[PDB]
Predict the 3D structure of the following.
Amino acid sequence: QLHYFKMHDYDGNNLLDGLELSTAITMSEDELINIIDGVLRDDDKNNDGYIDYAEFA
Amino acid sequence: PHRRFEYKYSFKGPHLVQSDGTVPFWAHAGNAIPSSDQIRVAPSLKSQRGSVWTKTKAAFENWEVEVTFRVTGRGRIGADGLAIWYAENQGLEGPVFGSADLWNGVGIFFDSFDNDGKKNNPAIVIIGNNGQIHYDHQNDGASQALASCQRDFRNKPYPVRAKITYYQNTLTVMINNGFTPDKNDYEFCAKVENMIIPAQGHFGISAATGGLADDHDVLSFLTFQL
Ligand SMILES: OC[C@H]1O[C@H](O[C@H]2[C@@H](O)[C@H](O)[C@@H](CO)O[C@@H]2O)[C@@H](O)[C@@H](O)[C@@H]1O
Ligand SMILES: [Ca+2]
Ligand SMILES: [Ca+2]
Ligand SMILES: [Ca+2]
Ligand SMILES: [Ca+2]
């Protein structure tokens, strides 16, 4: 699972953001945006624009 | 104050461009080349103009952007320089460092070339505009200079970084000068007090060359909601 948290933490911060997810997924921009916005809405409790491992599980 | 990353107003590698050669959420233009780890906004060629601007506009009251770039040429003299923008309209093409003039907001010009012969270059420079000013190119805009400083950003050994915060009508510009890789070893450059800008609008970045020419590469453009 952690293996998957990390697949796309390219900058290494132990935090995934919108751009790191975009690539996870890579189709239209709006299509893309909707999915990323979904993820943040869905996971980003503290609303810093990142999802940590806690938010991931 | 808290920060929130705004991916939709940002870019970065290692996989910065799509298969089809486009940058997500940004419009690149003229001679800007996006690539996997950076955008060469304008290359070391004669008379280049390139710019990259956010597609969607952006509505935040107070914000910060960290922007990371290199500017490179053989000569200890180079040209023309680079320009970070917040403003109301996408100003893709135009004579102001690759971008549109008569702009509505702020522009932070990294002027490589000493255009008014003053020895005051290279220098960073802040400039307001409400939709009717013409950037005094030949005079570096030294007259429209809300504020400014004299830091040398060419040919450094680490990519240069510029934090540009607008917090409660105070815009501030911090600068790592590429001497350290400490991505948070900023030095104070300058600061503009009591300054409004459009409530909404785009972020952009642009650059250009003329008779002289550096490569102008931007590696990332991270944007935060405060
Ligand atoms: O030399 C012809 C050149 O003219 C103009 O560029 C000049 C000036 O604007 C630049 O700041 C410096 C440094 O690049 O070079 C010239 O002296 C431009 O109009 C340019 O397109 C043209 O090639
Ligand atoms: Ca990350
Ligand atoms: Ca979070
Ligand atoms: Ca100049
Ligand atoms: Ca000058």
